[PDB]
Design a protein around this ligand. Structure first.
Ligand SMILES: [Zn+2]
Length: 446
């Protein structure tokens, strides 16, 4: 037979959202939970008791179901092994600059210099705040293409022309793919915009628009290709594709080409398999729906049209043709193997979300070629991590100072009118005076 195969990896999770890897050599797997947790799965199969990221108080994670309001996406820096930088997109509640139900946030975190299995929450750097009016069509998928730019895939938000021209506390960002350069040396702006962006100068972060209700978009690293499903509310069910070509400066927007290859209604999303266990699946675009029907989008090299071809599941040994509940998201190994994350109203009430791995029974679990050696995660050691006083330290390694600090790593304090009579500037605008010199700058004696 030619079916694939699913295997239970982990259970007892709370509403899983997705899972990814650190890219750091430790084959850690970080799994997202909707209430606002990122847990670590060890390559040997242990869930660490302490979460990697516990941010549940900051995130307004909606109850309902169909309610989309939780933690949305995580992305690791291509040089996290050096700089230890995360990017999280989540939904939060105090905004007073316009109308909202909530605001979709994009924040940068950094691992604890002391614990490689936990980030310290004090490192939060808000990158983007996107005012949202509705509790659907949110999106928020984060990803790094090659050349190292960060992509954010924001949905419709169900944002309509009425509310756009009604109030101004509304964002330009919804329904768009945004591409950013996090590798800034600037300290005035949290992120730089690459010169190869369309609207790089225009009187900007928007790389493409048109998106409505996208699932998890498939990402081909090969130039980059991102391919999205889209629900469009109750209006068909289409695929939209973005390709960037090979090193080209944009001044007008690339087309977000639409086509309609789907038939089995709404889809959760897809992935590009670049794993190792399955030879045949290599380089395939896979999309699954809520109930676990899988497809393949394949492109004719001749008549560049897209075609869907069903994939079957089937049991072979304890690796089974089915899984429990409904698919909520997808996952990937550092080795590139792919997972589905499931739950149900029955297994939500009990905290029983599952991680399931997809398997090719036609191949061995460890083909000779797929052998890799685990490189256990280490504590940050980079220059900026150890020296940069307080105030954020950018992914490039440049150390940005908080008000009233100066120097390469912000070690020297600033005294606006300088200290006198041999005083020492200890904190910003604080002088440590020698005995018998009083006042804010030690300017007095008698
Ligand atoms: Zn106005």
């Amino acid at each position: 037979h030619n079916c694939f195969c699913i295997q239970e990896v982990v259970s007892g999770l709370r509403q899983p959202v997705g899972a990814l890897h650190s890219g750091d050599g430790s084959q850690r797997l970080f799994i997202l939970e909707k209430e606002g947790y990122v847990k670590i799965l060890t390559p040997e199969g242990e869930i660490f008791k302490e979460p990697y990221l516990d941010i549940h108080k900051l995130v307004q994670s909606g109850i309902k179901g169909g309610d989309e309001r939780g933690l949305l996406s995580l992305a690791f820096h291509p040089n996290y092994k050096k700089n230890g930088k995360l990017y999280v997109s989540y939904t939060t509640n105090r905004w007073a600059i316009g109308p909202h139900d909530h605001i979709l946030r994009v924040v940068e975190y950094t691992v604890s210099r002391k614990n490689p299995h936990q980030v310290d929450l004090r490192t939060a750097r808000v990158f983007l705040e996107v005012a949202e009016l509705h509790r659907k069509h949110l999106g928020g998928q984060l990803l790094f293409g090659p050349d190292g730019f960060l992509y954010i895939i924001l949905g419709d938000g169900m944002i309509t022309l009425d509310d756009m021209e009604e109030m101004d506390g509304l964002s330009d960002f919804t329904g768009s793919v945004l591409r950013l350069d996090v590798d800034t040396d600037m300290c005035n702006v949290p992120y730089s915009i690459p010169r190869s962006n369309p609207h790089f100068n225009s009187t900007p972060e928007v790389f493409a628009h048109g998106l409505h209700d996208p699932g998890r978009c498939a990402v081909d690293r090969h130039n980059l290709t991102i391919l999205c499903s889209d629900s469009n509310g109750k209006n068909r069910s289409s695929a939209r594709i973005l390709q960037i070509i090979k090193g080209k400066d944009y001044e007008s927007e690339p087309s977000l080409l639409e086509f309609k290859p789907f038939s089995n209604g709404p889809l959760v999303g897809g992935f590009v398999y670049r794993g190792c266990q399955s030879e045949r699946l290599y380089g395939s675009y896979v999309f699954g729906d809520r109930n676990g029907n899988f497809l393949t989008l394949q492109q004719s090299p001749v008549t560049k049209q897209w075609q869907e071809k069903p994939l079957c599941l089937g049991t072979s040994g304890s690796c089974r043709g089915y899984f429990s509940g409904h698919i909520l998201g997808f996952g990937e190994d550092e080795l590139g193997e792919v997972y589905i994350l499931s739950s149900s109203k029955s297994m939500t009430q009990t905290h029983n979300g599952k991680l399931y791995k997809i398997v090719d029974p036609k191949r061995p679990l460890m083909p000779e070629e797929c052998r890799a050696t685990v490189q256990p995660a280490q504590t940050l050691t980079s220059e900026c991590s150890r020296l940069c006083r307080n105030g954020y330290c950018t992914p490039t390694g440049k150390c940005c100072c908080s008000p009233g600090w100066e120097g390469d790593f912000c070690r020297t304090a600033k005294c606006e009118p300088a200290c006198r009579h041999g005083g020492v500037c200890v904190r910003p605008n604080k002088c440590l005076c020698k005995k018998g010199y009083l006042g804010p700058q030690c300017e007095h004696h008698h």
